[PDB]
Amino acid sequence: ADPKEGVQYEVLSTSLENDGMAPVTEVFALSCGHCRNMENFLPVISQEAGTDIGKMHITFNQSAHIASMFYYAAEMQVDGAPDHAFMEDLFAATQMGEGTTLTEQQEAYSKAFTSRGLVSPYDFNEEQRDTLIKKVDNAKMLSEKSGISSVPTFVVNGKYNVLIGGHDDPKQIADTIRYLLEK
Ligand SMILES: [Mg+2]
Numbered sequence: 562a563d564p565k566e567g568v569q570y571e572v573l574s575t576s577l578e579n580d581g582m583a584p585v586t587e588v589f590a591l592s593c594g595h596c597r598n599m600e601n602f603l604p605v606i607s608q609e610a611g612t613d614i615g616k617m618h619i620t621f622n623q624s625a626h627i628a629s630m631f632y633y634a635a636e637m638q639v640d641g642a643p644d645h646a647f648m649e650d651l652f653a654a655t656q657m658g659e660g661t662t663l664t665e666q667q668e669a670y671s672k673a674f675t676s677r678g679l680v681s682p683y684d685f686n687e688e689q690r691d692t693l694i695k696k697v698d699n700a701k702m703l704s705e706k707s708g709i710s711s712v713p714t715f716v717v718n719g720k721y722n723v724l725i726g727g728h729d730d731p732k733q734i735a736d737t738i739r740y741l742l743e744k
């Protein structure tokens with residue numbers, strides 16, 4: 562019944578213990594349908610693990626740096642990470658798919674901000690741009706340092722990565738998180 566190394570979690574080869582991530586961090590990508598659908602189970606996992614869950618946006622290619630820019634632009638204007646409804650708008654914009662232009666995508670991104678009274682990144686001022694660059698660059702560092710390939714996933718105290726393939730449901734993910742926190 563104890564979670565086991567190599568099955569329901571692994572020890573990251575390069576620890577991020579001291580790099581300031583939330584004790585429980587969901588590593589995700591706005592382009593990933595799986596991460597989009599996982600949003601729906603985050604309330605249950607957060608409740609059974611008994612802690613809030615932070616977010617880190619990973620990047621696997623250049624195209625993804627645009628997604629990461631929109632995400633950190635959202636994150637920096639709200640308390641904590643963007644809520645599940647703001648997250649849905651950003652997922653939806655990123656995954657518009659093949660018959661959509663880069664322009665239609667950009668207007669969906671932009672709407673997510675303005676419709677909640679926030680500033681769209683194109684309209685940022687000098688100060689905001691400076692804050693955004695620092696956030697994206699930190700994400701980029703932490704991503705590359707972690708070596709993570711597979712999202713969504715959950716990192717606990719910057720040192721263990723939960724293997725979601727090793728769990729049958731969200732309760733079991735939450736239980737592994739708790740076990741790792743309870744070391
Ligand atoms: Mg915030």
